[PDB]
């Protein structure tokens, strides 16, 4: 007859229960701006190279 607390809480719950949306939103969006450095791990690489040849 209505739109109610009962239904709104249903929607709320389902929202809370839906893992796919929130996890995808955080992980996939945050996955893209991942990386910028002249790695010191690569500093190791360079140093080794210096020692290499």
């Amino acid at each position: 007859x209505x739109x109610x607390x009962x239904x709104x809480x249903x929607x709320x719950x389902x929202x809370x229960x839906x893992x796919x949306x929130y996890x995808x939103x955080x992980x996939x969006x945050x996955x893209x701006x991942x990386x910028x450095x002249x790695x010191x791990x690569x500093x190791x690489x360079x140093x080794x190279x210096x020692x290499x040849x």
Partner: protein
């Protein structure tokens, strides 16, 4: 005082006072350094390693080999080796003895000049000499004439020596030593 001799015939390196029957101990002249990020923070980082210490430690170390073809490749590395050998094995100070040096014959002056320069300056040492292998080989073998073949770690030799004299024209010198053979082995 007393008199001390370094062997720098390549391979493990031999050092001992006059009149001992055999050198106190002997070291490969490997030199080696780290290969990987040092990730035990507890560890002290030492950046260069030599001798049986390295021979144990080898795996993450990687080797440099400071003598090619009997020619000593990189001086400061040698200096590291040399310093270590004195202090760690020998417990000896450069003043303490004359010191005697052991040379491939017929090879570039530079080894002479820098070796002496360093060891008189960097070490300060009463008396210095550099001597050609075959002479020692005769003295030990005790026949005043001869011809010697000794193909060590390093460059491989023919010298006839007659009693009391050199025939430097006679002499043949070859880079065929066992290391390169071994690399053929693979």
């Amino acid at each position: 005082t007393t008199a001390l001799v370094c062997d720098n015939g390549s391979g493990l390196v031999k050092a001992g006072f006059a009149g001992d029957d055999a050198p106190r101990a002997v070291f490969p002249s490997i030199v080696g350094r780290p290969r990987h990020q040092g990730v035990m923070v507890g560890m002290g980082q030492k950046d260069s390693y030599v001798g049986d210490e390295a021979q144990s430690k080898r795996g993450i170390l990687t080797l440099k080999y400071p003598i090619e073809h009997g020619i000593i490749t990189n001086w400061d590395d040698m200096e590291k080796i040399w310093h270590h050998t004195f202090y760690n094995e020998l417990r000896v100070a450069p003043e303490e003895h004359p010191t005697l040096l052991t040379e491939a014959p017929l090879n570039p002056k530079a080894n002479r000049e820098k070796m002496t320069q360093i060891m008189f300056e960097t070490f300060n040492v009463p008396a210095m000499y550099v001597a050609i292998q075959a002479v020692l080989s005769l003295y030990a073998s005790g026949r005043t004439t001869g011809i010697v073949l000794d193909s060590g770690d390093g460059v491989t030799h023919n010298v006839p020596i007659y009693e009391g004299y050199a025939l430097p024209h006679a002499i043949m010198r070859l880079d065929l030593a066992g290391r390169d053979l071994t690399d053929y082995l693979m």
